[model samples]
Target: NNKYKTKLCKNFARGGTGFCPYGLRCEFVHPTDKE
Candidate 1:
C-alpha cells in the first residue's frame, strides 16, 4: 500500500470520494497531503 505514495489519488486530493477511475480499487493515498 505504501507503493502508491508517488501516484497519490487525484480523487482524494479533490476532497471527495468515487472520483478515481479505479474507485476503491485504487492504491493511491487517501486525501494525501494537500493534493
Candidate 2:
C-alpha cells in the first residue's frame, strides 16, 4: 500500500473505508485472501 503514502496528504484511501485489496474488508493492517 505504498507504505500508506496517502496519509501524508491527510487523505483516506479505500482501506480506511474498508475496501482494501486485501479483501471485502480492510486488511490494511495485514494481508489476506491472497486476492
Candidate 3:
C-alpha cells in the first residue's frame, strides 16, 4: 500500500463516478465502498 504517493480522487468528494485508477490500493475510498 505504500507503493504510491497517496493521491486523492476528485470524483470522491461529491460522490461522483466510482472510478479509481489505483484500484484496490487507491488512497481515497472507492465509490463501491462506503467511507
Candidate 2 residue runs with Cα over 4 Å from true position: 1-17, 24-35
Is 1 or 3 the stronger prediction by lDDT? Answer: 1
Better of 1 and 2 by lDDT: 1
List the candidates ranked by TM-score, beginning with the highest.
3, 1, 2
Error of 1 at 18 (Å): 7.0
Tens digits of per-residue lDDT, candidate 2, 1-35, equal 45552222111333455344534344334332332
Backbone clashes in each candidate structure, one number apiece? 0, 0, 0
Residue lDDT tens for model 3, 1-20? 35454345775656766566
- lDDT of each prediction vs. the true structure? 0.60, 0.36, 0.59
**What's the TM-score of each model vs. the native?**
0.35, 0.15, 0.35
Number of the top candidate by lDDT?
1
The TM-score, computed over Cα atoms with residue i paired to residue i, of candidate 1 is 0.35
